[PDB]
Each structure stands twice: as C-alpha cells, then as structure tokens.
Structure 1
C-alpha cells in the first residue's frame, strides 16, 4: 500500500547465499581460555594462602560464585547458538513453503494480502534463553567447594546425603584417611580412584595385584567389588590433601624448632 514496500518477500538464491553466510560468532576459544584461567587461579590459590593464615572461606565462596556465573554464561551462550540455528532452519523451511513473486504476487505482497516470513519478527518472537538441562558440577567446582575443609583438617567427610548434619547426626565416626599407604610407605605419587570403589590407590602395588587377574577385589574394606585398570582416574583431592598436610607439618616443625631455640 502507498509506498510499494512489501513487508516481506520469499527467499532468493542470491539472498540464500547471504543466509548461508550468516552465523553466530563463536566464544568456544574465549570460554575455554576463561575456564583454564579460572582453574589455574584456583590451583594457585590452593597453596597460595599462608598456612598460618585462616579465613579463605570468603575467597572460596567468591570464586565459586564466579565459576557458577561463568558456567551460566556458557550455558546461555549454547542456548543462543541453538536458538540461532533453529531460527535459521524454521525461516528457511517457511521461505521454501512460500511461493515466488513473478507477475503480481509481488503486488499482492505489497498490498498486504500476502505475507512472508521475516527473520526480524521471528528473532523478536524467539523464546528467551533458559538455563535448563544444565548441571553446574565440575571437578574444579568440587575441589573448590571441598578445599576449605581439607585446609581445616586433612581428613574430612563432606557428603551429607545420609544426613544433612553429618554422616550420622553429630558424630562422624569415619576414622581418618591416611596419606601413607600401609602397603607402600610413601606419599601417593599417582593417586588413582574408582567411580565404584571410591578409594584412592597409589597404583604402584595395585598394578602388581591386578597383573595376571582380569578383575581383583578392592583391598580396602567397607566395600566388596572388583575393578580393572581403566576404572581408575586421577583424583586431585588426594594430592591436594598431601600438599596441605606437608605444608602444615613443615610450618609447625619450623615454629616448634624456632620456639625451642628461643628458649635456649
């Protein structure tokens, strides 16, 4: 009507060139660089704070909030790109469905009696991104959450699935997790744990037990299962505990020696 400017027209092959050219610009490299940066910052912070200094809980909470915000950003960016591709597919299908303007179909579209899909309206009507079907649980997040307790004491039992207060009401009765293996009187240089056994092993003597037998029972108690080589994975918690224990024992030995010399 009036000025012959139709609201929308069917897609053209020349316009199809640009439609295929249009894409959402990526953040995969940016996101992975950010993730690696925050992970290495957490790793540095693990031993960065002075052993006598206490109160890393607020910094841990702040870093947890930062990581959660980053993960939410990544999830909604994935939502962005999937929405973009779905919108492109819907628009191309609608354009293919609609006819082509040759003689007066353009006039009909201009008069408004005929309508064609418009990417602007579709992008205005696309649903807002939703952080659904996404879980903010990573190994870095887990170690970040559990590191304050390890800092407080090397032996801790954080899970509260059985009871929110502790493992059993107020008393854990969980014993201690020893850095030095009775089998191998040495710190765990290769901490390997099973998703089923949930026990950390040095693997130096475990390979000797697992050679010649396809599956062998877990030597530790409180469980009964057989595992192979490929069920073992690296557990950062174990060497985190080892490092904090060594650092604390070094600082306490230095303090006691210095005070004893000050006595003389």
Structure 2
C-alpha cells in the first residue's frame, strides 16, 4: 500500500516555479541572493524528504539515509547571481563549484554569438567534457555522429565518445536580462534627449 508519485509531481511543481523565476526579475531588482538561498532551502529540503520517503521503499524510527546531494540537476540554481553581474560571464559548472576559473573566463571570447556564423545561440546543446556547442547548424553534417576524432575545431584536447549534445538551459538566460538592461539605457537616453524640448 503506497502513494509515491505525488511527490515527483511536487518536484515538477517546484521545478516549474524555478522556470517561472528564472526570467521574471524586473530591471529594478537589486540582488537576488536571498531569493537564491530560499529556493536552495526549499529544493534541498524536498531532496531530504525524498530520502525520508524512500526509507520505507526497502520495506517508526528507520535507518539513517546518509545520501548527499551530488546530482546534476542541482546546477539549475548555482549560476543566477553571475548572470545578474554582467554579460561577460561564462558559468556552466559541471566540474568547478565556482566560476569558470573560479572568478574569470580567460578562455577565448567565444560568446553568446556563434564562433563563425556569428549569431546568438538559439538552439544549443553542450557536451559534458568539451563544452562544444552547436545548434545543429551548418556544422550539422560534416562527419556528424563519428566520435573518434576531428570534432569541428582544430587541435582539441581529447578523443570523444558518442553522446551527441545534451541539455543546458543557461544559454539564453544571460542574454535575456543583459539585452533588457542594455536596451533600457538606450530607451531612457533617446527619451530624455527630446522629452520636453
């Protein structure tokens, strides 16, 4: 006798709330760290409750859980402040708990804009060793799917195996607020230049 998936549903409920917040901040917002901390509290508390409920799946005062947060989906929360700082940031963690070089990028300014066909990334996917990104664009069919050598960039630093390219939601989030804030200055200046002459 069990009732389980209600709480996967509540997981989805908090996830969809995170997706709500990620793009709802107004240009007038100052700091988000308290919001980040509160979402962290709720997320990790629900994670602990995940163990508190699974403790009886093996089947009160049961055995201690001892599981610790080491999953990939925790990444969805880490980055927001450094998006709030300025567009110069590059952040996807995978490995580093802190920023790219724990503060700085310094890795060659390949940016929102594509390295060659210089448009902003609009349908990207990342690989979790190389950080190569494509939108299945004009690099779509050179030798696609043949992961032994010659991923389309000269002298990379590893041989690769086939996982194509996978989820990364960080990409357009930094673009959104950056463009909003930068265009607000242009709007205000163009206004005040002519306002009441």
Q: TM-score range by the shorter chain?
A: 0.7 to 0.9
Partners of 2:71 and 2:94 in 1: how far apart?
Answer: 18
**Alpha carbons 1:195, 1:231 under 8 Å: kept:** no
CA displacement 1:128-169 (0-9 Å, x = unmatched): 445646342455431211112112223435589999987668
Assess if the C-alpha contact under 8 Å between 1:149 and 1:156 holds in 2.
yes
**Which structure is larger by alpha-carbon Rg, 1 or 2?**
1
Q: Note if contact 2:146-2:162 (Cα within 8 Å) is conserved in structure 1.
A: no
User: What are the Cα deviations for residues 183-228 of structure 1, in whole angstroms up to 9, with x where unaligned?
Assistant: 2222222211111212332221231333495545344578423547
Counterpart secondary structure, 1:60: helix
Asked if 1:183 is matched to 2:109, the reply is: no
Give the match for residue 138 of structure 1: 71
**Are the aligned partners of 1:191 and 1:201 in contact in 2 as well (CA < 8 Å)?**
yes
Q: Is the 8 A contact 2:113 2:120 kept in 1?
A: yes
TM-score of the superposed pair, with normalisation by structure 2:
0.78
Task: Confirm or deny: 8 A CA contact 1:200 1:238 kept in the other structure.
Answer: no
Q: Aligned-pair RMSD on alpha carbons?
A: 3.5
| Distance in 1 separating the partners of 2:168 and 2:46 | 24
**Aligned 8 A contact 2:127 2:164 in 1:** yes
Structure with a larger share of its residues in helix: 1
Aligned to 2:41: 65
Deviations 1:73-125 (A, max 9, x none): 01121112214xxxxxxxxxxxxxxxxxxxxxxxxxxxxxxxxxxxxxxxxxx
Q: What TM-score does the superposition give when structure 1 sets the normalisation length?
A: 0.61
- Give unmatched runs, 5+ long, in structure 2: none
Q: Shift in Å at residue 58 of structure 1?
A: 0.3
Q: Distance in 2 between matches of 1:234 and 1:160?
A: 13
